[PDB]
Design an enzyme around this catalytic site. Structure first.
Site, PDB file in Angstrom:
ATOM      1  N   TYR C 273      -0.613  -7.381  -0.551  1.00 28.72           N
ATOM      2  CA  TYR C 273       0.303  -6.569  -1.428  1.00 28.72           C
ATOM      3  C   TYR C 273       1.488  -7.050  -0.804  1.00 28.72           C
ATOM      4  CZ  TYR C 273       2.410  -3.007  -4.324  1.00 28.72           C
ATOM      5  OH  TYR C 273       2.908  -1.972  -5.284  1.00 28.72           O
ATOM      6  N   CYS C 274       2.503  -7.563  -1.957  1.00 30.84           N
ATOM      7  CA  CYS C 274       3.684  -8.288  -1.462  1.00 30.84           C
ATOM      8  C   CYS C 274       3.899  -9.137  -0.631  1.00 30.84           C
ATOM      9  CB  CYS C 274       4.506  -6.591  -1.310  1.00 30.84           C
ATOM     10  SG  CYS C 274       6.481  -6.741  -1.348  1.00 30.84           S
TER      11      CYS C 274
END
Lengths: 546, 533, 538
Positions: C273-274
């Site tokens: 994530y990210c």
């Protein structure tokens, strides 16, 4: 086994003979400075009358204790003759003394005499000890209430006015300005006496029980004026004497709206976000709680160093004040404090005495007289009777949260819903306590030192709560014990300590300076501000004087 | 067209900063007073700043979007952020204010909210406006019922202490009124006394509110012995009292009462709304019967004599509805004031929030708007036959403009009145349209003068010289069309009270008349009879 | 142009009325069965939206016409305040303070000037070398002190492990950089290959473990997958020399060793994530460059940036004088303060948090999700100073990964050597990782490539469980030459893309292995690292 006592009396008798020579030469010289148009100190004979009693009573006691190996009366008869000789000689020695000075001495003698009687204070009252001697439950409150209202009522009827000391003239006369005033305090910034001062300013947090000017008494024993002379910009918090309007003020408010607000006030006056903090008694407790509040909330450090005088953080050993730390007594006081709104200082005066130096008479009446000073004992007695009220909520918190439940040690103490952990405080701390202290027993002050999470130093000073702390270097009067090492016990620390005579103030000043390096800044002339020092708050008396 | 609105908000925001600076210095000074035994602008200035933040930010936002997801949803969302910010700032500004004090502001704010809603009043309700014989009469009653009960749930200041506190004495008490004579505040007063005929549709103390805005107190301070009629709140026992009774037994009787206390048969007359009309019919009644004139001057505030322009009260004046009310009034005894309060509001100033709540607060006064809303909701009943007389003989048939009106079988003719008459009307008046009052001046036969105030029905009348808040139009020439007198009218500014004072003065002094003991202290007991205790 | 708006308002009013009636019948039937946020509040807000929109229609149909609208809108605001406090009569004081706190958080979060990235003045200053830095410092301190008093403020903030991040599990490893959580099976049989989740080190991980109804970890666990999560330590000044390289090797890769120690499997399914997806990509690159046996079977990358040529609104900071100043500050303090990053940009910016995650969430009987999202977004973390410098200079400014110049512990990174199949899941309304830029990074990989585009923004589009049936996604298995061409050939599907991700992971297959019960670790899940707050809670 009377050698050291006759030696001490002989030493005083020679110092008194020299002073009589001085006054005789002084009275003769004053006759020279006379003009034909024009129209304070006690006589040496008054002290000589007292010296003769001590010598004659000791001689009579030694003579009748060797005769021991009629007998009770004959010693009594000879000692009454000594008392009668003492009454005659004292009254004679005050022959040319103006009546006002006689009433002054009559006033200060009556204070001394009442203060040395344990039954006059609840904490040392023997009858109140009987009640606490596992005797009863809630009548304890009524029994304690009868003694308190009787000790108070006796002090009510006793309560001379004109023959007193004036703040700003005789005591608390260090030049400076009140630069901020809020509900809780007046912030005083003192005028410089040096060309350069240190960059980091000094903020003194006094106790809210009793007034601050014990630390600024007279130029010779003023901590404030000595600190200013060491090139420090000195700020003093002058607490308001609380009335009913301050009923809901709590210990939390003194920490945040007091010390923290005063820190911000120092920044407004100087531009410095960090100060050297000095705290005395419950003010030292308030200073420590302010550091824990800032650290718990991860605010930037605002106290570079912290010196704590006779400061209780652990209340496990409350001393004589422990007689009040019992749930029925604490509950009853909480009800009175909520109803009345405040804890009357005049009621606190009969409860305990912050001034119980074992040698107030010898070192601060006789010795100060022979040093050419107006008796420091008079000044100390004035300060001890300049009682302050305590806000009802604050007094309840002091009684329950600190003295009874010991929340700060147990980690349960919260200041404005913020839990306080002194382990997060990394500010270097110097704790200075007094061996003969009866309010903050020095062993308990030692125990609180380990709560901090940074550098820790301890100094044990000779003498008691007041005399040991307010010891100027020029006096050369007492000593202190220093041990840099860490120890597992108060007694182990003392065992490894080294003793030095004189004042410990230079050690505190060394502790503050070694930390700073920062270049000396130009001397800070205090702004005009709101008022001249001392403020208006310090003059508010519970029993007004006229 | 954004310039003068940002300037007016800058003027108010700067006045609020100065008041805030004054409060901070006053609290700082209070610290030097440190007595240990006593405890040391009820609204906080932060609360008013929250309102001013909303007005400025919404005006900024609405200028910003008017220059150019959907662009309208963006304006809708952003203004909702301002409403939320205003809510949060108001609640936080009231944290230190006591809960009993906070229950106050919730009370009066709800009044102002409900008082500016047209749907809550019959005369300005869209559904009633869209009206038919029985259907209208049954419907109006049904609608009246829905509005009255909603008001009742909301319904669930002291006279003499907070309002109507001018010192005086009750000199005479009759069935219809209590006569109040006020104590003098000058060493000398005029010989001819002053008598004020208030309306009986609402209580009298709108003309005596607070010392700063009390007409009575100002008149006494101008050297005048001032009397005041205080109409009784009529109960069911007064079901058969009439305008004729209010004229003869209400007004003329008070004239004989004034003479009994001063010895003067002639007084300076002052009338307000329906009180001015009752005075006018009284003056003609003495003139129609050829009695010696007993009124020296007549000042008539928003007095309706020609009823050709009823305004929003027009919806009520239809033949089916009037009859409906005539039967109900006689059946129930009186017309309920709580229903009349639901019919319309006398509080419709275009700047009630700005000039009487914000401006009042910035002048250091307790909000005047609070007092007006207390007075408007302190409604009084009107007797059944009086109301039926007003609806038919005056509003509908218009008998006063013609010669058909009669007071106790005596034909009136205002042309026989030769007393100087002064009309003081309001431009924003919604009850007494100023064109109608101006036309009704011509019925008089003596000297006439017309003055137009800058505000609505009560704000343009209650304007002391000390306020310096509004203005007035005057024109010495005689004009025959409403737009002709006003087009030639000149604006002066300030209060018109000194101009009304001059009209009385132009037509020797007597030692100040100390009122006798009488029956009770002023205010009387009639003013305190409330419909909702 | 008002029709859709009025219809949507009546659309929402109908559910509130329908739910209002369900509460009267439920309390009526509660009178019979006995022994031994108010709807009125939402209706007050609904009345304001309708009454204001009605007013704007009328006004659209000089000083007075303006003032008449402005006056009228104020009466609506007064009615809103009066009705709102009226609806809050019987509500307990403890919950009202929570409503009053999260409302204050929302209003500030919706003011563009409250964040440096959307700050109007900074854009003027940027459009000026030392001057821009000094000016940007003025807005930085002004916004940080202004956010002091408002942020610091109650105990009603949720507790991790009770209201959020409450998925059962055990902390099976604790190093300097992370705590490794292994979750409880909940299923009799799990897949042989375990799943490892790499969250961003900026902000915390519970965004993927909010509540059981929207917890990605709980959904993955129920899908018969052994799930691991990396809980990054909130770095203090003692972590001042921790670099991007350390988070790749001593982070992701060390956590791969931890997964093998607790299960025996050297191969895991990767989810990132990210900036966690970036670190996972860099770890696969590091492993491939040194010719180590493949340890990542599949990698799914949520809103991850590998090409930084489209920094979005965050590109206002990406300039030589600004990055040079930030590097000096980061080296001095040793740490980039997360309280300072809080006023720099927001990771949470959905189009209508109020309409979709407060009003709608309340209508579905849930505690308002907009509160949980705001609590997470305010749960700032620090960034190690060297790590932040590397992120600013080596990736955002120089774009070394795309040019092949990025070195992770003296090992040049080439994503073309990574043969692990990759699934990039991006969000069309994302403001931190613009989806077109995430599409460009997909081509850097040297194996199978799939792209999924979600309908909402950075957070709402990603955390969309299949039970909500709220949004959609675009899939296109063919390769394209531009983001625009890929979307033109995409096919829209309603619902959550989570099942499509699980199809991606599972279609590689194998035999189900018996459910792995976590050993008694150092602590229960969630651990201690996730609870460390920059502003401590009461």
């Amino acid at each position: 086994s009377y050698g050291p006592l006759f030696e001490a009396l002989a030493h005083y008798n020679d110092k008194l003979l020299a002073m009589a020579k001085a006054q005789t030469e002084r009275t003769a010289q004053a006759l020279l400075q006379t003009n034909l148009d024009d129209l304070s100190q006690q006589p040496w004979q008054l002290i000589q009358a007292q010296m003769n009693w001590w010598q004659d009573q000791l001689k009579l006691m030694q003579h009748t204790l060797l005769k021991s190996a009629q007998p009770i009366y004959d010693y009594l008869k000879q000692s009454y003759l000594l008392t009668a000789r003492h009454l005659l000689a004292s009254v004679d020695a005050l022959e040319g003394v103006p009546q006002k000075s006689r009433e002054r001495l009559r006033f200060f003698t009556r204070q001394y005499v009442n203060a040395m009687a344990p039954s006059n204070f609840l904490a040392t009252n023997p009858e109140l000890l009987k009640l606490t001697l596992e005797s009863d439950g809630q009548n304890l409150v009524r029994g304690l209430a009868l003694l308190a209202e009787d000790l108070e009522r006796s002090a009510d009827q006793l309560n001379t006015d004109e023959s007193a000391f004036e703040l700003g003239r005789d005591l608390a006369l260090t030049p400076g300005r009140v630069v901020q005033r809020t509900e809780l305090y007046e912030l005083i910034q003192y005028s410089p006496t040096t060309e350069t001062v240190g960059k980091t300013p000094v903020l003194i947090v006094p106790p809210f029980i009793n007034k601050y000017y014990i630390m600024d008494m007279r130029p010779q024993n003023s901590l404030v004026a000595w600190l200013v002379a060491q090139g420090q910009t000195v700020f003093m918090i002058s607490w308001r004497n609380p009335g009913v309007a301050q009923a809901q003020i709590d210990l939390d408010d003194y920490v945040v709206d007091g010390v923290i607000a005063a820190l911000d006030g120092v920044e407004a006056a100087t531009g410095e976000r960090e100060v050297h903090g000095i705290g005395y008694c419950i003010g030292g407790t308030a200073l420590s709680l302010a550091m824990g509040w800032l650290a718990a909330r991860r605010q930037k450090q605002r106290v570079r160093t912290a010196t704590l005088f006779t400061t209780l953080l652990d209340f496990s050993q409350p001393g004589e004040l422990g007689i009040f730390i019992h749930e029925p007594i604490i509950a009853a006081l909480e009800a009175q404090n909520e109803a009345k709104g405040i804890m009357d200082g005049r009621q606190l005066a009969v409860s305990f005495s912050l001034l119980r130096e074992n040698s107030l008479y010898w070192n601060y009446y006789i010795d100060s007289y022979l040093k050419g000073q107006s008796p420091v004992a008079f000044d100390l007695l004035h300060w001890n009777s300049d009682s302050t009220n305590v806000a009802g909520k604050t007094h309840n918190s002091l009684l329950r949260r600190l003295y009874l439940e010991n929340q700060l040690v147990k980690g349960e103490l919260k200041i404005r819903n913020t839990r306080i952990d002194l382990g997060k405080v990394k500010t270097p701390v110097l704790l200075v306590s007094a061996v003969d202290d009866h309010i903050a027993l020095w062993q308990g002050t030692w125990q609180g030192m380990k709560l901090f999470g940074g550098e820790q130093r301890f100094l044990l000073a000779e003498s008691g709560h007041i005399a040991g702390i307010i010891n100027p270097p020029a006096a050369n009067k007492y000593g202190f014990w220093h041990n840099g090492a860490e120890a597992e016990s108060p007694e182990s620390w003392l065992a490894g300590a080294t003793h030095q005579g004189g004042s410990w103030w230079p050690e505190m000043m060394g502790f503050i300076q070694n930390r700073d390096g920062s270049e000396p800044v130009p001397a800070r002339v205090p702004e005009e501000g709101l008022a001249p020092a001392p403020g208006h708050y310090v003059k508010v008396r519970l029993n007004p004087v006229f």
